[PDB]
Amino acid sequence: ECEFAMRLVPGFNPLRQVDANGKECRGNVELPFCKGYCKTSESGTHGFPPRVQNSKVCTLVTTSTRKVVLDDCDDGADESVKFVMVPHGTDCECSAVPLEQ
Amino acid sequence: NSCKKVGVEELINEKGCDLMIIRINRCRGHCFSFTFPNPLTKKYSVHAKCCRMVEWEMLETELKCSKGNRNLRIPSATQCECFDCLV
């Protein structure tokens, strides 16, 4: 139903991070990508709301957090911009939580 | 991507009122979606389609209850399509 893959996304090919004093670190950051065809539906009901949506999207099952290190750094950069914390997992599932936020 | 119109018979069996079968339409299908955690915006990035009824008609019926008849309203699909989940 869903499919997991590590993928490069426009904003992170490469990712640029700038601290105060203007020092920047750059580097590719793979992101966890869930894609596929969830089973969804919309139907009429009684009362309010008059509609019922089983709306679902392919979401990552988060099981850990990855510290991705950015390599290409300007001379004298803060360590806070030398890494990124990315939610990590290995599987996808159909879920409506992305629709909530 | 396949979102289809599906016929539904629906039985109303409430204590006091006569049993009533109502035939309406609902959408059911599978549309493509993709989602990834964006740690820059610290949120989910979603690009997703859901199977939804674009157009519908109201179906009105009288429910013969012993202590007063009730007037029911149900949307019934007329076109089912893959469209934005959040619209």
Question: Which residues from B are below 8 Å from A32, CB to CB?
Answer: 36-37
Distance CA B63, CA B17 (A): 7
Candidates B34, B37, B40; nearest CB to A11: B40
Amino acid type, B68: G
Rounded to the nearest angstrom, the gap between the alpha carbon of residue B3 and the centroid of all alpha carbons in its chain is 12
Residue A19, phi then psi, degrees to nearest 5: -90, 175
Question: Which residues from B are below 8 Å from A90, CB to CB?
Answer: none
Q: Which of A58, A28, A69 is nearest to B35 (CA)?
A: A58
Ramachandran bin of B16, using left for φ above 0, alpha for ψ from -120 to 50, beta for the remaining angles: left
Residues 50-89 of A with CB under 8 A from B: 50-51, 53, 55-60, 62, 84-87
Domain boundary assignment for chain B: 2-84
Q: Closest Cα of chain A to B25: distance in Å?
A: 7
Residues 6+ apart with CB under 8 A from B78: B5, B25, B53, B55, B56, B57
Q: What fold does the segment set B2-84 form as a domain?
A: Cystine Knot Cytokines, subunit B (2.10.90)
CB atoms within 10 A of CB B59: 15
Distance CA B16, CA A11 (A): 61
Preceding amide of A87 cis, omega within 30: no
Tokens of A55: 């709306």
8 A C-beta contact, residue A56 and residue A40: yes
- For A59, the domain range is 2-100
Technique that determined the structure? X-ray
Q: How many domains does chain A have?
A: 1
CB atoms within 10 A of CB A74: 14
Enter the resolution in angstroms. Answer: 2.3
8 A C-beta contact, residue A87 and residue A60: yes
8 A C-beta contact, residue B39 and residue A70: no
Rounded to the nearest angstrom, the gap between the alpha carbon of residue B58 and the centroid of all alpha carbons in its chain is 12
Distance CA B84, CA A77 (A): 42
Residues 6+ apart with CB under 8 A from A18: A24, A81
Inter-chain CB pairs, A–B, below 8 Å: 122
Cβ of B74 under 8 Å from any chain A Cβ?
A: yes
- CA B47 → CA A19, A33, A58, A94, distances in Å? 31, 11, 10, 14
Question: Which residues from B are below 8 Å from A42, CB to CB?
Answer: 26-27, 50-53, 77, 80
Give the β-pairing of A57-60 and A15-18.
unpaired
Contact A86 B37 (CB under 8 A): yes
Which parts of chain B are beta strand (E)? 2-12, 20-38, 43-63, 70-84
Q: Closest Cα of chain A to B69: distance in Å?
A: 16
CB atoms within 10 A of CB A89: 18
Distance CA B51, CA B68 (A): 38
Amino acid type, B69: N
Residues 6+ apart with CB under 8 A from B8: A43, B23, B24, B25, B26
